[PDB]
Structure formats: C-alpha cells, structure tokens
Structure 1
Amino acid sequence: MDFQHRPGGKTGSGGVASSSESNRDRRERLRQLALETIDINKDPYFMKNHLGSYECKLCLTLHNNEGSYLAHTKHQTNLARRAA
C-alpha cells in the first residue's frame, strides 16, 4: 500500500477528545480570550467572584458567560452615575 500517502497518524496517540472535553476546552479558551481582551482594554470594572463568576462593579451586575460581560460595554450611563 501507499504508506507515504496514507492519512497521518502516530502511535501512542490517545485519540480525539469527546464533546465534553472539547466543550470545556472551548470554554477555557473563551475565558482566556475574554481575560486577554480585558487586560488589553484595562477595564477595572471586571471582577471574579469567590464562586467564580464575572461581575461588573461599575454596573454591579453578575454575568453567566464571558460574552455576557463582553457585551456589557447600559454601562456608560451606569459609569456616569457611579462616577459621582
């Protein structure tokens, strides 16, 4: 057989991860991307709870997902209200 034209595979691989492992890896990567964009934007309103949840201290609003806080950018009117 064409050994140099078979699809590539290596011994001792372990296989492809399941849906749950890929889902939690995607969630961890989304958390890392959200933290990278928060550190790039340098927003001090972001906080992580003791139970591990996103919180807007300028809005005082909890967020279930990272994109919930990423869409929380109302926040300008709440920042103007909490400025004084």
Structure 2
Amino acid sequence: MDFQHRPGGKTGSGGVASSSESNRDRRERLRQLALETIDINKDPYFMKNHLGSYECKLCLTLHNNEGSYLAHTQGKKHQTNLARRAAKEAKEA
C-alpha cells in the first residue's frame, strides 16, 4: 500500500449527505447570494414575507425563489412609472 499517495480522508467525518440536505444548503446559499446582491445593488423594494418567498413592493408581485425576483428588473417597468410620483413630490424636474 502507498499510504502517502492515496486519496485520503479524516477520521470521524461522517461523509456527505443525500440530495435533501445538499439542495437545502444550496437554496440557503442562493438565498444568501440574492440578499448580498440586493445589498450591493441597494434595492429598497425587495421584501421577504412570513413564508420564505420574495416580493416586489412597488410591483406588489410574488416570486417563488431567488431568480424569479432577480430576473424581474426589465419587465413591466413601473420604475419609470414612479416619475409621476416624483412629479407629485416635486413639481419641477
């Protein structure tokens, strides 16, 4: 046997889990990824509810997972329809 040039491992490891804990940690990691990307992009309208789904607040729209929200930046542009609210806020440009 070659004890130095074998694929080794540490004792008392337990291994790695099945698909359930792996994609659970994958969904939590994608949740943290989405939260840090909206933290860098500084989005004040992204909001999470009481059941782990995402919401656009000016949109008032649901999103089941992360990529459902972070693909909603191009369609139904109410972000340019807040120009009426800005005109109500200030009568001049």
SS in 2 for 1:75: coil
Structure 2 residues not aligned, in runs of 5+: 88-93
Deviation track 1:40-76 (CA, whole Å, cap 9, x = no partner) reads: 0010110111222211001100110111000011453
Which ranges of 4 or more aligned residues in structure 1 deviate by more than 3 Å? Answer: 74-84
Pick one of 76, 81, 85 that aligns with 1:78: 81
Tell me which protein shows more helix as a share of its residues.
1
Percent of pairs with identical residues: 100
Q: Which moved more, 1:67-76 or 1:21-30?
A: 67-76
Q: Rate the CA distance shift 1:11–1:81 in 2: closer, same or farther, 3 A.
A: farther
Relative contact order, CA 8 A, sep 6+: which one is greater?
1
Q: TM-score, length-normalised on structure 1?
A: 0.87
Quote the RMSD (CA, aligned, Å): 1.8
